[PDB]
Amino acid sequence: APVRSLNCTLRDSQQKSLVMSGPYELKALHLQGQDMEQQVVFSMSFVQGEESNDKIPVALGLKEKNLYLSCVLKDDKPTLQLESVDPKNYPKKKMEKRFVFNKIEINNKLEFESAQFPNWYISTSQAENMPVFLGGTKGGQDITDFTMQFVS
Numbered sequence: 001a002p003v004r005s006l007n008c009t010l011r012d013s014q015q016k017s018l019v020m021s022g023p024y025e026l027k028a029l030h031l032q033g034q035d036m037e038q039q040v041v042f043s044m045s046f047v048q049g050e051e052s053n054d055k056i057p058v059a060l061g062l063k064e065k066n067l068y069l070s071c072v073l074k075d076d077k078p079t080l081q082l083e084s085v086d087p088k089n090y091p092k093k094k095m096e097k098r099f100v101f102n103k104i105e106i107n108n109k110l111e112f113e114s115a116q117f118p119n120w121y122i123s124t125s126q127a128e129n130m131p132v133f134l135g136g137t138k139g140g141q142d143i144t145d146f147t148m149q150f151v152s
């Protein structure tokens with residue numbers, strides 16, 4: 001059948017919101033009130049991949065945009081990028097591996113591990129207004145835990 005998708009927002013465990021701030025750029029900052037309209041709405045697709053009770057393979061598209069979070073090597077490192085696709089062909093159930101995250105539920109928080117690069121996670125910095133990135137440890141100063149708000 002089709003691929004199933006839900007609209008949602010993400011906030012890091014510091015309670016920073018995510019916003020589209022430049023061509024292919026997502027930023028984490030503290031947001032409340034009117035400015036909350038600026039936050040990015042995701043279409044989270046439930047995709048093909050290895051699955052267990054608390055580990056669910058997803059793709060993260062931007063709502064009604066042909067843009068997906070993806071994990072690729074750049075200048076020889078696992079990095080997070082926003083990648084454009086053919087809007088006729090996406091989303092699909094069999095997303096290419098660079099688009100797949102393992103959504104992991106631990107202690108009432110979510111982590112998003114790269115399917116392509118084991119133990120690399122969607123991360124934010126403690127500082128305001130810095131890029132969302134792929135970080136090679138769910139330990140230390142960078143933030144790898146999120147919560148998920150469901151959107152109409």
Ligand SMILES: O=C(CC(F)(F)F)N1CCNCC1
Nearest residue numbers: 024025026080081082131132
């Ligand atoms: O924000 C990103 C990647 C993203 F979060 F959008 F996926 N950056 C910063 C701008 N250049 C690409 C890497």
